[PDB]
Every structure is written in structure tokens, then in C-alpha cells.
Design a binder for this molecule. Structure first.
Ligand SMILES: *[C@@H]1O[C@H](CO)[C@@H](O)[C@H](O)[C@H]1NC(C)=O
Ligand SMILES: *[C@@H]1O[C@H](CO)[C@@H](O)[C@H](O)[C@H]1NC(C)=O
Lengths: 198, 210, 166
């Protein structure tokens, strides 16, 4: 019930400001492979050892964390929290190369898979930086969550990122809807591909 | 020095139970509530419940009530979290996390290192389907375990091939898609993907034609 | 459907390549002009400056391509003792089976030669362009020959150069 932007990014020396929309709010930083760590508590207070370039505030229904003077080790996932509730999380990238927009290719199910009484939509996403994207599937303009499996992004040989997302459907679901869409958003910019039976 | 040390990574099948241990030292074990928090791969944090190690009283998150058991053993200052009836979407890193003091019970100040619990289905060879075009490919669907090898045209085709890392699905099975970029040229050149899954001795060739 | 070249020893599938160009000799001495795979040597190929890392004769493999259309060059068009460098714009895959042959799309090879003939025609005027097999040579030059994977392979190219374009 605490919503955060999916991602944020800045170069070394810049800042990122991360909102948390719904009492107190606290903030955690989580490096890859590590446990989260509290960096702000009671809206704006810093635990011992946290540098003063981390700050927090709250106005009305919205709290925000700012990491100023960005350093490479600030690249992490950030979560707000209030009692047992965690925010949806923000992946923060400290920019190390030019940004790049995702390329998206969407395949419909094959005849052979439909003959096996199965159906899979395949959405392939490549050549993007920062390495964070939001993938949303739609059945005729309505969101579908069941049947979705999405990879975490992975480095390509050209140092940009790739990811893939799959939608499992019954043949009846595929043939009954007019179209299906894979929508991928990258720092608030959305592109979409659409496929349809026949 | 406060330390919370968890048990090592676990690999389970659907229907199993897992019990993660969290060995505490360096503070009053019965003096701090211990919480459990999990995180599915690539997803966010989710609180599972707390145990009060003094009384062994508990408060589980409603969506785990009936399936989770939190216990402790003060003689070895260890807290435990047992999750039953595992499905593959319970694949996640499971953390124990300490309440800081009597008044602040939620700004978790010390955490265990995490315990990865992965829930896999039975060994199974892939089904392979064409991804018709330009970009064309092969869908390598519902296999376990890793890895599979995908070549094109028996190795005659090597450049232009991007084989995407597999996804672990909620079925406990993996699925990837190897695609090739071509100029289109589609009517002349024949494209066949060769998929080998040695753990199941599955080998399959599939022609990809518009 | 395929022009199948017999090769010795048998190139494996991972030694398949893109044909990105070729090198020809114009026959010296009826409004027709005859071209054959080059009677030159490594010096002719080097002067073309369109090869890749692959050492090969009569055909450039995994080399540079032209942008829009076939480009043909010569140090001297009137000199039948100097080779003609042909740079293709779209590569022609040559796929080896590992059983002793390497295969080329007959349809795409005919379309490639047609464009080459058109470029040659706008250089020599004339009407009829004829491709004929090698006049002869040592094994590495009378065959389309190339190195791959520590081996040197010899492919007879007779079927690649026997066609008339009017
Ligand atoms: C040409 O390139 C392909 C694709 O990278 C490679 O497999 C092949 O070995 C190359 N050909 C030669 C003759 O080295
Ligand atoms: C030839 O080049 C194409 C791209 O134009 C590439 O996809 C293909 O793998 C290459 N073929 C060989 C045999 O190296």
C-alpha cells in the first residue's frame, strides 16, 4: 500500500529523489546480494554512520528519500516502509554509460504450440540502459497478472541490458480476446507491441 | 557485535516444507522481537510475521496464516521460520531481522545474511516451438534443470544469435528464447535451431519458417 | 536448389561463411566478354583490400561489404593481367555440411552474378557477359580454397562460374 517509482537514476555527484505514497516512514537501502539496511528512520532521522547526504521528508500522504552527491555504491534498491508495510521499491542506477531506449519484439503463439493445446506470448527486450524496465501485459486494454513471468535484466556483451517476459495462456484465452499487448516502460517512457489471433 | 547468522541455501520440490534457522549472538536474545521478511527474485520485500522470543508469542501476516510457523530455542539463541506446502512462487530469499529496542519494533537494525529457497519441479526436457518472423527464434519451453544448449543450422549460423537467459516460472520449470537477427532473405535461407538438454537426453531440431 | 561444391578435406559446419566478394580475370584476345576466377595470386587479393581475417582464394569470406550495390574495381580495366575485385553488397552464405560439401543458394548466386554482369557491362560496354571456370592453376588457386580451424580446405568452384548473361 506504499507506492514508489519503479526506478531512478543519476550520474556521480547528482541526486535522486524517491517518493513513497500511501504515521512515520523509514527507508532501507539494499545492495545486490545483501540484506537491506536502514538509512532513514522517523521520516528524516539518520542512523549513526549514515552520511548527511541522505535525507528524508514527508508532506501529506507522500514521503520522499533523497540521496545527494551520488556515489557508485549508492546503486541499490530502495524501499520505504511503515510498520509491516514495505513500499514497492525503486531500483537506483548511478549512471556509468549513455542511456539507451529498449527495443521490444513480441511473438504470438505458434501453430505447433496451439496444437499441443498451449499458448505462450514472448516479449523480448534488449539494448536498454539503465537496466530497469517495467513490463505490463494487457488483454484488450485490461491488465493481466496471472500467467506472467519476467526475468530480471541481464548484461549483454555490449554492456546494455536485456530481459524477457512470457505470458502463458490457454488457447481459448488467446482465441477469445481481440489482442494482447506487452507494454514496457523505461524511466517513465512507455512503448508497446501488440499481437492478435489470425 | 550483534550477529544474525542464517542457515545455507535450500532447494525443494513443490509440497515440501522448509525451515530456516537464524542464530543470534551479541545481544539479549529474548529482549528483541525477531521478524521474518522474504523477497522473490527481482521483486520487493514482504513481511511474514514476528516472534517474541521471550513468550514465543507470534503475529503472522494474514496471507501466511495457516502455513507459517515461527519458533525459537533460547538454549542456542536461535529463531526459526517454517513455511509449509511450498510452491515454486515461494522461491525467494528469506531474512530474519531484529527489532531495535522496546519502543521501536520496526526499524530493523540487524539482519541475517538471507537464505535462498528455490522450489523446482521434476527433471523434464524442453518442448521447442518456432518464433516465426527481421527476427525469428525458438522458444525452449518448460525444462529442468539448467542448462540447455541452442545452436543454429548445426553451428553454421553463429553471428546474429542472441540467446536470452532463462526465466524460472511459477511451474518450477525454466523457459528461454534464442533469436537470430536477419535482413529479410527469409525465402532463401533455411533456419533450424538445434536444442540439446543433456540432463534429460533431449535433442530436437526445429525449422523456423514464416 | 543449391550449388553444391565438393571439398577436400571436408569442412565442418562451423566453417561456413558469408561470401562478401570475389576476384576475377577477364579473358584476353563477338561482343561477349569472358570472366573466370582470378589467374593471379595472393598479391592480387591483397590489392583488393576487401578481405577479412580469412585467407581464401577466388571468393572473399567474412570480409567487407559495399553499402548499396555491387562495386567492381581494377587497377586497370584494359589490362587482362590485372584482376578485377568484386565487392558484394549482400553476402551469400556458403554452408558446409561436414560430409564433404559446401552449399550455396542457386537462386541468390544467379542474382548476384546478374548484378556483377551489369556492373561489368557498364565498364566494358558490350552486351554478353560469360562466366567460365578457372583456366587452371596450383590446387590452392584453381580451387576456392580457405583456412578454417587449423586446416586448409580446397573446394572445386566449377559450378559457380558457368553461366551466360545477355
Ligand atoms: C566466418 O564467420 C562465421 C561466423 O562467425 C564463422 O563461424 C566461420 O568460421 C568464419 N569462416 C571462416 C572460414 O573462418
Ligand atoms: C552472415 O552475416 C549475417 C548477417 O548479415 C549473419 O547473421 C550470419 O551469421 C553470417 N553467416 C555466416 C555463415 O557467418
Amino acid at each position: 500500500a506504499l507506492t514508489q517509482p519503479p526506478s531512478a537514476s543519476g550520474s556521480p555527484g547528482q541526486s535522486v529523489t524517491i517518493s513513497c505514497t500511501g504515521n512515520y516512514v523509514s527507508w532501507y537501502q539494499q545492495h545486490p546480494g545483501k540484506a537491506p539496511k536502514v538509512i532513514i528512520y522517523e521520516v528524516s532521522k539518520r542512523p549513526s554512520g549514515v552520511p548527511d547526504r541522505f535525507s528524508g521528508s514527508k508532506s501529506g500522504n507522500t514521503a520522499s528519500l533523497t540521496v545527494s552527491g551520488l556515489q557508485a555504491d549508492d546503486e541499490a534498491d530502495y524501499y520505504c516502509s511503515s510498520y509491516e508495510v514495505f513500499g514497492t521499491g525503486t531500483k537506483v542506477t548511478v549512471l556509468g554509460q549513455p542511456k539507451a531506449a529498449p527495443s521490444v519484439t513480441l511473438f504470438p503463439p505458434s501453430s505447433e504450440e496451439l496444437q499441443a493445446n498451449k499458448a505462450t506470448l514472448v516479449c523480448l527486450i534488449s539494448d536498454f540502459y539503465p537496466g530497469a524496465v517495467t513490463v505490463a501485459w494487457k488483454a484488450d486494454s485490461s491488465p493481466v497478472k496471472a500467467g506472467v513471468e519476467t526475468t530480471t535484466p541481464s548484461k549483454q556483451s555490449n554492456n546494455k541490458y536485456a530481459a524477457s517476459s512470457y505470458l502463458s495462456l490457454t488457447p481459448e484465452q488467446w482465441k477469445s480476446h481481440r489482442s494482447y499487448s506487452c507494454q514496457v516502460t523505461h524511466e517513465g517512457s512507455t512503448v508497446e507491441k501488440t499481437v492478435a489471433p489470425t | 557485535q550483534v550477529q544474525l547468522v542464517q542457515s545455507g541455501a535450500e532447494v525443494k520440490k513443490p509440497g515440501a516444507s522448509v525451515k530456516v534457522s537464524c542464530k543470534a549472538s551479541g545481544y539479549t536474545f529474548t529482549g528483541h522481537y525477531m521478524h521474518w521478511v522474504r523477497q522473490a527474485p527481482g521483486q520487493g520485500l514482504e513481511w511474514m510475521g514476528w516472534i517474541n522470543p521471550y513468550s514465543s508469542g507470534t503475529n503472522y501476516a494474514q496471507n501466511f496464516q495457516g502455513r507459517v510457523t515461527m519458533t525459537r530455542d533460547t538454549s542456542i539463541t536461535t529463531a526459526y521460520m517454517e513455511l509449509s506446502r511450498l510452491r515454486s512462487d515461494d522461491t525467494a530469499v528469506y531474512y530474519c531481522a531484529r527489532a531495535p529496542d522496546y519502543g521501536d519494533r520496526w526499524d530493523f537494525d540487524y539482519w541475517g545474511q538471507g537464505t535462498l529457497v528455490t522450489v523446482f519441479n521434476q527433471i523434464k526436457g524442453p518442448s521447442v516451438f518456432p518464433l516465426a518472423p527481421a527476427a525469428l527464434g525458438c522458444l525452449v519451453k518448460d525444462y529442468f534443470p539448467e542448462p540447455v544448449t541452442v545452436s543454429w543450422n548445426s553451428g553454421a549460423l553463429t553471428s546474429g544469435v542472441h540467446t536470452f537467459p532463462a526465466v524460472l516460472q511459477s511451474s518450477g520449470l525454466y523457459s528461454l528464447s534464442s533469436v537470430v537477427t536477419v535482413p529479410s532473405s527469409l525465402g532463401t535461407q533455411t533456419y533450424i535451431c538445434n536444442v540439446n538438454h543433456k540432463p534429460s537426453n533431449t535433442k530436437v531440431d526445429k525449422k523456423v519458417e514464416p | 536448389d543449391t550449388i553444391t561444391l565438393p571439398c577436400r578435406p571436408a569442412p565442418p559446419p562451423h566453417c561456413s561463411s558469408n561470401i562478401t566478394g570475389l576476384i576475377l580475370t577477364r579473358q584476353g584476345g563477338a561482343n561477349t566478354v569472358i570472366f573466370r576466377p582470378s589467374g593471379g595470386d595472393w598479391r592480387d587479393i591483397a590489392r583488393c583490400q576487401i578481405a577479412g581475417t580469412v585467407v581464401s582464394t577466388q571468393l572473399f569470406l567474412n570480409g567487407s561489404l559495399a553499402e548499396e550495390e555491387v562495386v567492381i574495381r581494377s587497377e586497370d580495366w584494359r589490362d587482362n593481367a590485372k584482376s578485377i575485385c568484386v565487392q558484394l553488397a549482400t553476402s551469400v552464405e556458403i554452408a558446409c555440411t561436414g560430409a564433404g560439401h559446401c552449399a550455396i543458394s542457386r537462386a541468390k548466386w544467379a542474382n548476384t552474378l546478374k548484378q556483377i554482369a551489369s556492373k561489368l557491362r557498364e565498364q566494358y560496354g558490350a552486351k554478353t557477359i560469360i562466366f567460365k571456370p578457372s583456366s587452371g592453376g596450383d590446387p590452392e588457386f584453381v580451387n576456392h580454397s580457405f583456412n578454417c580451424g587449423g586446416e586448409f580446405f580446397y573446394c572445386a568452384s566449377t559450378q559457380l562460374f558457368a553461366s551466360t548473361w545477355f
